[PDB]
Design a binder for this molecule. Sequence first.
Ligand SMILES: [Cl-]
Ligand SMILES: [Cl-]
Ligand SMILES: [Cl-]
Ligand SMILES: [Cl-]
Ligand SMILES: [Cl-]
Ligand code: NA
Lengths: 251, 256, 259, 250
Amino acid sequence: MDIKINDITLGNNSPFVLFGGINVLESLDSTLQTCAHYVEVTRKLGIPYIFKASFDKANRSSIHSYRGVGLEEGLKIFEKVKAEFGIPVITDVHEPHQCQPVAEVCDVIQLPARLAQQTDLVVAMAKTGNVVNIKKPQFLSPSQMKNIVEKFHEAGNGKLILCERGSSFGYDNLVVDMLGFGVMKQTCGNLPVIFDVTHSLQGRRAQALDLALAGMATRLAGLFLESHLLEDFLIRIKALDDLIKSQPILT
Amino acid sequence: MDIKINDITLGNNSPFVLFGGINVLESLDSTLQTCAHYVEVTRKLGIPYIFKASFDKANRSSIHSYRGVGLEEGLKIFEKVKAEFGIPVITDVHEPHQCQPVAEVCDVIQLPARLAQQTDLVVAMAKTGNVVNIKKPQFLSPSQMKNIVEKFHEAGNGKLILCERGSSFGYDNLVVDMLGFGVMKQTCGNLPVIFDVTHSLQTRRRAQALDLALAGMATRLAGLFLESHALPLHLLEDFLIRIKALDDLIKSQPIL
Amino acid sequence: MDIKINDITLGNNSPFVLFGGINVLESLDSTLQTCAHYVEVTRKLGIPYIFKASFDKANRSSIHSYRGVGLEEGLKIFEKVKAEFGIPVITDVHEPHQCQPVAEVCDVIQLPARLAQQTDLVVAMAKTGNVVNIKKPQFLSPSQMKNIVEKFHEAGNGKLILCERGSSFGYDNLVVDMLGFGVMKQTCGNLPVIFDVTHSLQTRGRRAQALDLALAGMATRLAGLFLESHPDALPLHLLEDFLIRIKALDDLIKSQPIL
Amino acid sequence: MDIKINDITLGNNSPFVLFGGINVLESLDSTLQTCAHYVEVTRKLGIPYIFKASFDKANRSSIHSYRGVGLEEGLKIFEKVKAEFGIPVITDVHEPHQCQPVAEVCDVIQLPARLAQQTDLVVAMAKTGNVVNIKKPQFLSPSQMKNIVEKFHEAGNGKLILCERGSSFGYDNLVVDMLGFGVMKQTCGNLPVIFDVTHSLGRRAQALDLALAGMATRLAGLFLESLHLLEDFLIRIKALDDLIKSQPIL
Ligand SMILES: [Cl-]
Ligand SMILES: [Cl-]
Ligand SMILES: [Cl-]
Ligand SMILES: [Cl-]
Ligand SMILES: [Cl-]
Ligand code: NA
């Protein structure tokens, strides 16, 4: 099943879409500068691109780390990003009451992994009618994603993306099960599956590349980066993706 | 470090405390009945007791599943429990705005395992000043609990209980690492460590719960956390006679 | 099901048996000194005791580190242990040809975890008619132990002990699943289950850990505890204090009927 | 570091080599038939090929289950394969005393994963001087492979292949950590790394996804088992491998 995001086609047999940006929104000027770099590199390669940032990040590593400019200023920044570049945007929501006003502006709304079974948030997100990115918890097996999908369907929204971020592997360590992509496709109606390589990890750039290439080899809708260098990386991913997506799914 | 919960002393070298009750509050009458049974059994066995229930099941499989009585009615039921039995109570909170009104009634407030890294909730819970039970996420290692403790400390609340509930082991399965209890004691300032045997089984019986509970309590713990309806309620007394026997033995031996 | 090992009764509802000794036989005099210490402490506490050592260490830290004294001299040292102290002994075998000569001297023969699905070794061990200790591989689940048991039964030997030694938990780390003991008892006919606490740690002071882990396991009602000490692995001089604690817990548990 | 196996160049920046065959040798005729098929598919696609089989099934479900032809007859069959097709062959050895006679016939000798820390078997394999395929235990981290490599080096043999076969993931399950390939290359001197997709695991769809993902990390070779499913798989793997190997290392 493909999902249209403005003029982008997102789907497991379409050219991959890059989801990338910055961790937390701080100012209009800085956001535009980073966004402009993603836009320039992706336009030069012909890769569809969706800008990501948090306006209120609720899971930072310290309680006084800056959580972002907050809802009202964050949405004003996202509006400017959209007007200036003509691209879609994505952000995470963690409070049910924020879903509607965020959805007025942000094309894709993201369900944080830890909150993925929180029924009130699921329902509030679903009711926006927007495209939703469902982050797979590291403690949930790929055959359980279908339960989350079901809850969205019950709440009236089938525009769902499933986003892999690794699985717990002993203590303090994540492994990405490359077989889980196919499990999610088969059990969840071939919804678009994208791969958050950045959170899947924890030199490092060489790791991100191997891991990204390995995941994209399985035929995926997109690559998600919590992130010369970007360009070189994307050249390699696009080479692999172009090859994979050009061959028909096996008989 | 011990924690006083009204007249109860909770600590890793004190007699174990039972945190026991039910999954979710369904009605006043059923709650009082179950609670009365826990109280009667624990008083006669001389086991200190805190009543547990959720007022909301927030992460059920269906949008149409029963969720429990909800905050307003739930707090009314907790108020009646406290007035009728004179015992402390514990319940979980899922949203920052719930913390202060819940804490006005419930002695211990609990941080759900999945939400344990949500900073907004941590801060809102810390600011209540109440005793907090931190459910250890299945996906976090015992050495990383200190990071959560640090956040609460930075927010000004040091009255924290660490609650084991098992670790992810491959897909859809949990294992309890009996070494993790000591790791938590050593790295988190010997705060009280309790064991939720009920949720540790998770994805596996009365025989199993008893073996697992005894194993964990053998490592010298401040308490045991459990649900009945989950253990059959009528087996509670026999179960607790066993856990107390072991706990009395273990706590009577000097540490080292 | 109980197993008689000379005058010892090994079983899940019997007083726990200590299987203790050393990693590898390296000498005579030092073996006897270590054994004597175990003997003295266990006799003083009334704990049944079986001396353990390998004569040939299969997985060595380096290719030239000493493998141990080998079969022939190893068996001679086991003979001396048995003659001097009157106790049973346990050792591991690695090749089918070793099974007969080791079984003639040793009261229990041990199937190494890494070799536990090697059919030729299983058959050769089973055919000795000796008591066998089966080490549970870290990569095998507890419900699969029944398949090894089956193969022994097909080959004519039901005198089997199951030994826990942890499960792989992510990379280079072991967890002991305390529920696996009961799984092994339920699926394998209530054969004796013992716990190798020494190899369960492995990848993790260590003394405080060994005690916590041993106490936790023994709380589930087990036939025995399997450990290694070093003569200066638990410090040998702390053995009495360690055993006092294990005995206290075991005596309590075993004194209550199963629920 | 590349390894020459007759006229095949095996290495992490060379075109991938297929190691394929059957589980256990049952008879000459079946073996030649299966081998002929692999040879015919690989030749037509231009993929270097090494025939694999075990002469013994060391873990049988029953004490009475079929065992395979055994060492003596097995080696005779490997000799015929080599004479008829002119290709290298690979087999596993489980006991030290087997190493020298097997190594007389088989080009590559394989160290089984559960036996990879058995020091007597390591030394006896090293001493053959043959190319050795070291199966990574499911219970070992990729950073520990350097310790096994060290032992082989100390015993005088540096012709070593490292082979991924998955890691224990809870009970009765395996996962393949795609980051382990790079860890093994960086810590073990860029020895050839290959991927046993068969033992890492409809199910044919799984093998293809997994094989593609692993080969995307740039590897020396693959293990695979067999309406023309083998050829359809290999067409895809070769396309990907050619692409990956054509990009400069970053
Ligand atoms: Cl997560
Ligand atoms: Cl709970
Ligand atoms: Cl959890
Ligand atoms: Cl041993
Ligand atoms: Cl093992
Ligand atoms: Na004997």
